[PDB]
Amino acid sequence: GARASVLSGGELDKWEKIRLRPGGKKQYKLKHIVWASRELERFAVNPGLLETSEGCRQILGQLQPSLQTGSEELRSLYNTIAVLYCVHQRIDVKDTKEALDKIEEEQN
Amino acid sequence: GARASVLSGGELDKWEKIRLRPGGKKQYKLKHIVWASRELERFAVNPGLLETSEGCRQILGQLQPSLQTGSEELRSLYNTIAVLYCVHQRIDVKDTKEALDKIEEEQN
Amino acid sequence: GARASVLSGGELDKWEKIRLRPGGKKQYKLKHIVWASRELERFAVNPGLLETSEGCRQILGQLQPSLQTGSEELRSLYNTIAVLYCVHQRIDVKDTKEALDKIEEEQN
Numbered sequence A, B, C: 001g002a003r004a005s006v007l008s009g010g011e012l013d014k015w016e017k018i019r020l021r022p023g024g025k026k027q028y029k030l031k032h033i034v035w036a037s038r039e040l041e042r043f044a045v046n047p048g049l050l051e052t053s054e055g056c057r058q059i060l061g062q063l064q065p066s067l068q069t070g071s072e073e074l075r076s077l078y079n080t081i082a083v084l085y086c087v088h089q090r091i092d093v094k095d096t097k098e099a100l101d102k103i104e105e106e107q108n
Ligand SMILES: *C(=O)CCCCCCCCCCCCC
Pocket: A001, A002, A003, A004
């Protein structure tokens, strides 16, 4: 029955097709979700917000003022959650860069 | 002479009568103060502010914007300091829930 | 060729003449820069901003709202970056206190 959570065309299937770099080989994996989860706890943010569009949207709001001075860890976290937001919104992005384009396009 | 800091009806005596849950058995102990202290240091906040009404009020102000997305650790910290604020204000709350009621009632 | 980075009258030479306390003996050393660097990473702030006037200015902006409730670690970090800002600006401060005077004087 496990196969119900890994349906073709579903969120996890989509996640694992998205490329890290706009013109790159490597793709998002389960370990990127696990890592994003740990990071939010270190930042005293509820990791359960990763599960929904609205939760990802609120996280991205919390993190946005910190982006400009933020370390690489912080920018990577923001980029990862932007991709998760697109997956939950069923927006068909091919890479991290398109996810960022969509998010800042939405904020307009 | 130690008994001067644990006077009947004093702050520590009151602290240790307050219940964690509105309808629960367990009560606040010294270890909850110790834990709140460690947490504020992790957040780069002066733990000495726990000693006064005004310091607890300023901490609660710093933490309030983080509550909505905050982890359980963060909410627990806020709840604990809300109870400490009530003790320092000599407001006779019976549990964490009444402390929260009083704090947000005061902010009106 | 290493001597090109430790020119007399240059930034590192100036740094290591500045006194920690307004009327004190001890002076800023390399370990204070190393420590400030680690601290910014713990705060998810890009340590590379320590390298420029503008980066130090942005860090000080990020940290300023946290100063009033901040722990000693936080105040020490702010004080150290204020001195670095003065060195990068070629402002000839003799101690931490003069650096703080200059920074808040500039913000007027
Ligand atoms: C419900 O749909 C049952 C179908 C059979 C599920 C098989 C999945 C087994 C996965 C093995 C563990 C993976 C270890 C890498």
